[PDB]
Amino acid sequence: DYEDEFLRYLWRDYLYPKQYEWVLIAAYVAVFVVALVGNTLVCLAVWRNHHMRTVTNYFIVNLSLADVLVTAICLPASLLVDITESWLFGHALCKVIPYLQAVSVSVAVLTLSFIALDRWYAICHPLLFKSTARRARGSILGIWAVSLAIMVPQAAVMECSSVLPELANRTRLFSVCDERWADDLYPKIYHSCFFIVTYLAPLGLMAMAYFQIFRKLWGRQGIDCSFWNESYLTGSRDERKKSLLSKFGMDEGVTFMFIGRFDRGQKGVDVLLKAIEILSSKKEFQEMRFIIIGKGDPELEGWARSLEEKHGNVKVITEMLSREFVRELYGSVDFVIIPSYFEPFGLVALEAMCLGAIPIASAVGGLRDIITNETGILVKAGDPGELANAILKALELSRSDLSKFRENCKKRAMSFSKQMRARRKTAKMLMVVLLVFALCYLPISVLNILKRVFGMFRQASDREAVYACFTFSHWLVYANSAANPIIYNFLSGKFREQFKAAF
């Protein structure tokens, strides 16, 4: 009957110090300083500069503030508890510190969620993208408010235990801090809801969001603007056009080029051929030159070759070409025709535009994104008529200087490529941050959801090994705070510049 209290009476002074305590402390100290100077360096880096004041970076700042809170208040307490197995602070801090722990976790996760949502709208729904600084400094307050509000049961149930309840002998060596609930279903509910709210739902939703983002950004790395450069072409452009046409046995005229595999339902060379057939009449056809390059279906090649034989102003090339020569072609011709059906990337547009060629493309896929007004002509796909009309307009535009137009094409292509690259980078960084977060908060979450709902680690000598895993999980939790600034330092150039500048 009195076995528990007597065994506690015989073993109350039994201390069995862990061999590897100094490795814990060290780690805890490391993580401590690294989390401080790290996260502060983030805050400063955003606060001092004007170019660093992005919504994303404001969120990052909120995250760093939360992690700073954790590092300053919760880390030393956790170290002391994990190393002495006792609560050395007051009865009030017994409620305050774990509360702030929960709140901090909440704020962090929610902040990451707002980042992910922001990028999801930015990438996957450009037209609906709205991210003012007022939305940030206004939703962050919502995050802190909700976090502070929903974590009050944590503060409520925290109590400072000492010895077995209903025991007349209040004698003790040390006290502890743990959760004291009225019922037994209450812990299960609060902790299941805690696990779902602060880990399951947001990391799930964010996984989905970054899945859509990465699926949208896949295969879009841009082009090599070091190769596709007009600087490697000689002479003037009209001289290169005259030379090119003369080489094919043609007189000077407004030159249109096509290049791509011959498809009945993709690259739309058939639409082009039909368009040329449409243009076979009219008084404007002899002012035009057509260069059809590619290889594919025998029928389409026969069609193109027959048109080449029919008209003296149409040249068909089934010959395998070099990248340098294609580059020359883009920097000689006046217009490039991209009559694609579903073109998802549209690299020909970018390259041609980089080399001064003005694109005439079907307004589909990536071509819509790349080509705007003043930077090209857009056409309804699968419609030879509207294509022919666009070609006629291109002819009517060639009666002007067209220099600033080509320059606009260059600027457009370059800026587009750079934007997509930067996008790829930032998305990469945020994904890494999220991943590291998930990994860091995983073990303590499974251990917590096991301990507080599905049974517990409480029976017999199943504790002095569970203790180690628990302390490690805790340290990991605090280690995340030190992890984020390093990630920023290795995956964000501006943060690199700022970190380096701070010393």
Ligand X SMILES: Cc1nc(C(=O)N2CCC[C@H]2Cc2nnc(-c3ccccc3)o2)c(-c2ccccc2F)s1
Q: Point out which residues bind ligand X (CB under 6 A).
A: 74, 77-78, 81, 97-98, 101-102, 105, 154, 194, 441, 444-445, 448, 474, 477
SS3 content of the chain, % helix, strand, coil (to 5): 65, 10, 30
> Quick one: how many helices (H) and strands (E) in the chain?
19, 8
Q: Give, in degrees to the nearest 5, the angle at Cα 90 between 72 and 193.
A: 70
Q: Which of 431, 449, 480 is nearest to 218 (CA)?
A: 431
User: Of 111 and 340, which CB lies nearer to ligand X in the complex structure?
Assistant: 111
Nearest distance in Å: CB 440, ligand X: 10
Residue 335 in contact with residue 275, Cβ under 8 Å? no
User: Of 111 and 445, which CB lies nearer to ligand X in the complex structure?
Assistant: 445
User: Of 78 and 340, which CB lies nearer to ligand X in the complex structure?
Assistant: 78
Nearest distance in Å: CB 144, ligand X: 17
Nearest distance in Å: CB 81, ligand X: 5
Q: Is 448 annotated as a binding residue?
A: yes
User: Of 357 and 477, which CB lies nearer to ligand X in the complex structure?
Assistant: 477
Residue 259 in contact with residue 326, Cβ under 8 Å? yes
- 220 exposure class (CB count in 10 Å sphere: 0-12, 13-18, 19+): middle
| CA–CA distances in Å: residue 386 to residues 239, 271, 272, 343, 349 | 31, 10, 11, 18, 19
DSSP 28-82: HHHHHHHHHHHHHHHHHHHHH-STT--HHHHHHHHHHHHHHHIIIIIHHHHHHHH
Q: Which of 323, 332, 322 is nearest to 230 (CA)?
A: 332
Residue nearest to ligand X (CB): 98
User: Of 85 and 238, which CB lies nearer to ligand X in the complex structure?
Assistant: 85
User: Of 74 and 333, which CB lies nearer to ligand X in the complex structure?
Assistant: 74
Nearest distance in Å: CB 484, ligand X: 15
Q: Which residues sit in the known binding site for suvorexant?
A: 448
